[PDB]
């Protein structure tokens, strides 16, 4: 995260670190949506142009973390993957359209002060909150500049008008994406950066005081560039697929 701040303890209890087993490194963010399901970006797991195609045994998820590097004894929980599900129409060839994946945990993670699921939005929650100028929140252990944080970083960013997103980039944008970030003339700054992909873009509903994950950190050209914006997977637009997977393969 660029131009963010240190998260407070338990501020983002749905935060998940996707962690490579060997070499032991941070791959991406992710989020906890139930005691056995984790949501992330497809591109964190599958990206053929770079020979990326992780299997379940290549990866762990670490849940309940604050410090990036430390083993947070008695606080974090580390889970093995039972199964990875990548959206069947994820477009890695062109523009990362439908950049979404689910990971089913071998065993349920125990909730705690530091571990708790985020809500996924309904149609009405999306319609109310996904409006230009409305701010969401992005969290991650990614780089601080286009170097690395000691603890989880947080930044709040405004959703951007769709024409402005389109005109910022040569990449073909789809209805399964939205962009967020401040304009050059807004003064304030901030963005996700390397290592933040797959983590959540959340909003707190003013109707029911609950946090909903509206986006997944998907792609951006550099980090925190003037006239450029972060692009996020539109979670509600793909919720039918999410529910399909969970309904079929959930226990």
């Amino acid at each position: 995260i660029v131009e963010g701040s240190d998260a407070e303890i338990g501020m983002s209890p749905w935060q998940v670190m996707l962690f490579r087993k060997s070499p032991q490194e941070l791959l991406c963010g992710a989020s906890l949506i139930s005691d056995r399901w984790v949501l992330t970006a497809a591109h964190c797991l599958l990206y053929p142009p770079w020979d990326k195609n992780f299997t379940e045994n290549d990866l762990l998820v670490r849940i309940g973390k604050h410090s990036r590097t430390r083993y947070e004894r008695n606080i974090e929980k580390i889970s093995m993957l039972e199964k990875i599900y990548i959206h069947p129409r994820y477009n890695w060839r062109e523009n990362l359209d439908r950049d979404i994946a689910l990971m089913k945990l071998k065993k349920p993670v125990a909730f705690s002060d530091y571990i708790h699921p985020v809500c996924l939005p309904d149609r009405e929650t999306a319609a109310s909150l996904l409006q230009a100028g409305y701010k969401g929140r992005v969290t991650g252990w990614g780089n601080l500049k286009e170097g690395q944080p000691s603890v989880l970083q947080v930044v709040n960013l405004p959703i951007v008008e769709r024409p402005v997103c389109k005109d910022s980039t040569r990449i073909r944008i789809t209805d399964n994406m939205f962009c967020a970030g401040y304009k050059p003339d807004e003064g304030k700054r901030g963005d996700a950066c390397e290592g933040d992909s797959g983590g959540p873009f959340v909003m707190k509903s003013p109707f029911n005081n609950r946090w909903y994950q509206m986006g997944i950190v998907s792609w951006g050209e550099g980090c925190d560039r003037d006239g450029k914006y972060g692009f996020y997977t539109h979670v509600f637009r793909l919720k039918k697929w999410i529910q399909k997977v969970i309904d079929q393969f959930g226990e």
Binding site: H116, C119, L129, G133, K135, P206, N209, R210
Partner: peptide, 29 residues
């Protein structure tokens, strides 16, 4: 949606607010 989803044990559950959530609320105009 899960019964208790989106309510943080250390914040909403105890009626504490984090340092920047008001910025979000203030944007929901």
């Amino acid at each position: 949606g899960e019964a208790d989803c989106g309510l943080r044990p250390l914040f909403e559950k105890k009626s504490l607010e984090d340092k920047t959530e008001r910025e979000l609320l203030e944007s929901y105009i």
